[PDB]
Design a protein around this ligand. Structure first.
Ligand code: MG
Lengths: 199, 175, 124, 109, 138
RNA sequence: GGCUGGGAAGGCCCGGCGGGGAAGGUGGCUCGGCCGAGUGUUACAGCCCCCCCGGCAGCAGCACUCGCCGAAUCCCGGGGC
RNA sequence: CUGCGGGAUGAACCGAACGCCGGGUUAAGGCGCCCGAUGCCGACGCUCAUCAGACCCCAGAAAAGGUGUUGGUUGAUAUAGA
RNA sequence: GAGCCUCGGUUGGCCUCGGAUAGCCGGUCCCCCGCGGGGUCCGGUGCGGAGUGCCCUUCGUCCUGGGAAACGGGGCGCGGCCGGAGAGGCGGCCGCCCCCUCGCCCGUCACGCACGCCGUUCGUGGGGAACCUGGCGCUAAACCAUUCGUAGACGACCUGCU
């Protein structure tokens, strides 16, 4: 009953608008791997935009001024918050349902994560256009834990490779076992393929 | 003047008969307009621009849509333009490839609006003529004059991005 | 089975299968499926009318004072004639629906909505 | 023995940008995302079920804490499967983005 | 690495539009994203059709680029495009989708029972095979 | 119902006239097993296309939905609020 | 002396003018999220900006340049070989 | 076991990396590397059927009376071996007792059949507070007061005292 989305290959605003709309409808949304987010335009454009945002601060007291979060997950969180009525109680309650993470944390490392084709770079962006990765942008503006995240993601990918190898073995054995006892399930298979299955 | 899916209208008109001139001559024009009501207005505008004739002093003798003779054949159409820019006016010749003459004129209007920011009211259509494979000046039309023409669909960006919005599979662009 | 004089639908699921006796149902509260059994060769009793299924209790002129007057009796009687009519109808209905395979088990099942199932998408 | 109502979400009231009409609610039925599948749900009964501190009566059962506000589907709302609904009492606006069950038995098929 | 090309005589499948889900053959190319199409054996007349709404299969019949609707039909019949298309996995999957769409509640109950038995049998066999494989490994 | 007393299209086609893409053909060359595939040159039609002479029910703004205007030349039925 | 919908904001702008309500439909404006509605399998083209651009009043720019790119006009020469 | 308050809900999916002018699955006759990984070649699909346009589970009960399939499940079943550290907070692998004949097709009836009328059906033995059963373990520290100056407007801070 909770949406888990993989942030790799998704555009910032395109995914943020959809996530905010779903969150306002009472849906619980989890966004994972926020370093895979990419933004349209060359890297220098987005670097300059984030530096210009960094310049924004209260002259009399920067502590009370804007909070420039450097983590990619917090950057995505702020972009989503910009698309919500966060000043109202309803907006805050909706924003409480949102949850973002750098990398893929252990609570969600063993879950299937969905992707939104309406926010993917391969779909929404021309192949000849340039883009910038959110992880590299964050690392060059103050982020500290890019290498640790990369190492943990490599370990997680190795574990996922082991699990996927086991799944391949299980599926291959399942397919062979179906062939072994195909004579005892012929009547069950015929009715399945009569109504539009296994075809 | 606006634009839609234009149709070709043949409009015939003359000045009102007078005792001085018992039998005034008849004039006809080719007008591409969304409907006959605006076709009559365009005919009167062009006739007043050319002849000493106005709507009050004249009448419309016949107004009728001109059907495409060969809608099922692909043809090359040459259109001679007369439009106004921010600066002075200019004369243009453009070529389009379409099944119908009205479709060619609509493509001309769309292309003029896209490339030169020219509205419909600033554009005057002078002559539209069908041309064979030869006598074509624009390489864009000419590159399709090939019996053994081959081209694939390299990057098929999928539609239905909002048909079921959350999916576990990433889409495919190679087909 | 039939539509009565009042316009209500004479409904009867097999008692041995659905535990539904001879009852009336309304059209607006019933989903009509695309599954029909051959019921032409049955004889529904004529005395089974709309006036036959009606309430009888709640008479006025009792004392009414106290913890009494129609809060008791705790039940409604079976009215054994109903059982005779139900048995007579079922003895004819049951073999015809048993002729079609898996039809009795389908009747024993209960319709419900599950995840990913939408009534407008499915066809009934 | 199972669920006999379709899932819907109270998206909000009928409104413009700066004016809100609380006598008509907007519903988001799950699985319907076009102005062509909403014809099935037209006229369907809808209820907003909630619980409260005090006990209330219950038809065919002992008193419970559950109270409901009954409603009716009126018309579709703008090409996206959104449905306009009217209730006997306007929704408390606390149920924004909460579950509203639309029944299946104003049957006409 | 392309195996599908817009060639004169290429058979195309219409994804969406008025003639959705109907085969059609390319006659001539009108523009970059528009071509003259003709569907005589599939109840499709000769009119322009954009490349967006068509996905072309691996069937190509040979006829001149501007044939008058008569020789293309003859080539379609000689090549027997309908039978070849019906033999393909693509049409079988489309028909499976249609069968799923038209399945009634009684048919859904039958399918539920059939899967209920079949999956149990298959998973019992899978467990036995897993035990045998573990025995072989040790 | 009208129109260009609709424009094209579909089928059997018959007796002709010319023109053009450039093909079961030829051919410099190239790629594989005489054939298959790709380019050019004069180029008739056994791949075709277009105009002119003429005639058949097969039509109908056609559920092969290629683009009109419509209603004493217009009526019936159903659903929701 | 005048409320109402839109122009984020608002004297005079656009629409439209006021008894209390229910249903339907519009104007001017809009339909990624805030925010009601394109969650159309919208159509044709143009544009890369290390100062992009994004709607009367209106909240900002000129002369002069660019083989950056996209169309048009005119003029020559090229198998007697540019 | 009652006993107050507060709400959301109304089957789950336990998972590769990934590219888009490309990808998925096996055998790998062949080679290399630590049962597995990598490469060459070969064979099947690709508008994805090893499809989220998807998969998994049935959502009436009980009697006996047959066929197909079959040793599966349960007693918050009891004891060992592990994986999992990013924010693990979940599962996997083995030993011993007892109980049941569960899934699919048909016979066989019986289940307040409450006589048409709404919040039915669950995650939930939900979360917070106060009171009734037992088995296994507990014995205080903080502050004030006093004291000191590495501290200090007052608070605060650094220290000592069976
Ligand atoms: Mg409840």
């Amino acid at each position: 009953q909770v949406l888990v989305l993989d942030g790799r290959g998704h555009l910032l605003g395109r995914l943020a608008a959809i996530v905010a709309k779903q969150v306002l409808l009472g849906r619980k949304v989890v966004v994972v791997r926020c370093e895979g987010i990419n933004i349209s335009g060359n890297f220098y454009r987005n670097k300059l935009k984030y530096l210009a945002f960094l310049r924004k601060r209260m002259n009399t007291n920067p502590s009370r001024g804007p909070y420039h979060f450097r983590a990619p997950s917090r950057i995505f969180w702020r972009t989503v918050r910009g698309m919500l009525p966060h000043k109202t109680k309803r907006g805050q309650a909706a924003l409480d349902r949102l949850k973002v993470f750098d990398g893929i944390p252990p609570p969600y490392d063993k879950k299937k994560r969905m992707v939104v084709p309406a926010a993917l770079k391969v779909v929404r962006l021309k192949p000849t256009r340039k883009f910038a990765y959110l992880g590299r942008l964050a690392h060059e503006v103050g982020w500290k834990y890019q290498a640790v995240t990369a190492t943990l993601e490599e370990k997680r990918k190795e574990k996922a490779k082991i699990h996927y190898r086991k799944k391949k073995q299980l599926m291959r054995l399942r397919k062979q076992a179906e062939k072994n006892v195909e004579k005892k399930i012929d009547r069950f298979t015929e009715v399945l393929k009569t109504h539009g299955f296994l075809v | 003047k606006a634009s839609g899916t234009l149709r070709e209208y043949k409009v015939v008109g003359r000045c009102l008969p007078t005792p001085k001139c018992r039998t005034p001559p008849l004039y006809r024009m080719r007008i591409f307009a969304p409907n006959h009501v605006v076709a009559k207005s365009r005919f009167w505008y062009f006739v007043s621009q050319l002849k000493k004739m106005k709507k009050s002093s004249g009448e419309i003798v016949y107004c009728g849509q001109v059907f495409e003779k060969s809608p099922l054949r692909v043809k090359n159409f040459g259109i001679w333009l007369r439009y106004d820019s921010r600066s002075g006016t200019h004369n243009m010749y453009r070529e389009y490839r379409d099944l119908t003459t009205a479709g060619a004129v609509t493509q001309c209007y769309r292309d003029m609006g896209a490339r030169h920011r020219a509205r419909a009211h600033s554009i005057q259509i002078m002559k539209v003529e069908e041309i064979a494979a030869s006598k074509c000046r624009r390489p864009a039309v000419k590159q399709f004059h090939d019996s053994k023409i081959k081209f694939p669909l390299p990057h098929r960006v999928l539609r239905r991005q909002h048909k079921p919005r959350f999916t576990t599979k990433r889409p495919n662009t190679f087909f | 089975l039939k539509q009565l004089s009042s316009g209500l639908l004479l409904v009867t699921g097999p008692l041995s299968l659905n535990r539904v006796p001879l009852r009336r149902t309304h059209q607006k509260f019933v989903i009509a499926t695309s599954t029909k059994i051959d019921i032409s060769g049955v004889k529904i009793p004529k005395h089974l009318t709309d006036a036959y299924f009606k309430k009888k209790q709640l008479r006025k002129p009792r004392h009414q004072e106290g913890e009494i007057f129609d809060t008791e009796k705790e039940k409604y009687e079976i009215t054994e004639q109903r059982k005779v009519d139900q048995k007579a109808v079922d003895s004819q209905i049951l073999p015809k629906i048993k002729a079609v395979p898996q039809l009795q088990g389908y009747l024993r099942s209960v319709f419900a909505l599950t995840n990913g199932v939408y009534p407008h998408k499915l066809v009934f | 023995s199972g669920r006999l109502w379709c899932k819907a979400i109270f998206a909000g009231y009928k409104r413009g940008l700066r004016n809100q009409r609380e006598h008509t609610a907007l519903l988001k039925i799950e699985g319907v995302y076009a102005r062509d599948e909403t014809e099935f749900y037209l006229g369907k009964r809808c209820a907003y079920v909630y619980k409260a501190k005090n006990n209330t009566v219950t038809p065919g059962g002992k008193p419970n804490k559950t109270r409901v506000i009954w409603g009716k589907v009126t018309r579709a709302h703008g090409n996206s499967g959104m449905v306009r609904a009217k209730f006997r009492s306007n929704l408390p606006a606390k149920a924004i983005g909460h579950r509203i069950r639309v029944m299946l038995y104003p049957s006409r098929i | 690495v392309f195996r599908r090309f817009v060639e004169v005589g290429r058979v195309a499948y219409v994804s969406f539009g008025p003639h959705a889900g109907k085969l059609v053959a390319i006659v001539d190319v009108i523009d970059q994203n528009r071509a003259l199409v003709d569907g005589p054996c599939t109840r499709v007349r000769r009119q322009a059709m954009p490349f967006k709404c068509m996905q072309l299969t691996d069937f190509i019949l040979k006829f001149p680029h501007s044939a008058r609707q008569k020789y293309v039909r003859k080539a379609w019949e000689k090549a027997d495009i309908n039978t070849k298309w019906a033999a393909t996995r693509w049409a079988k999957k489309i028909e499976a989708r249609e069968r799923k769409a038209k399945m009634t509640d009684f048919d859904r109950y039958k399918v539920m029972k059939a899967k209920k038995m079949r999956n149990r049998i298959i998973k019992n066999e899978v467990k036995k095979l897993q035990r045998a494989a573990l025995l072989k490994a040790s």
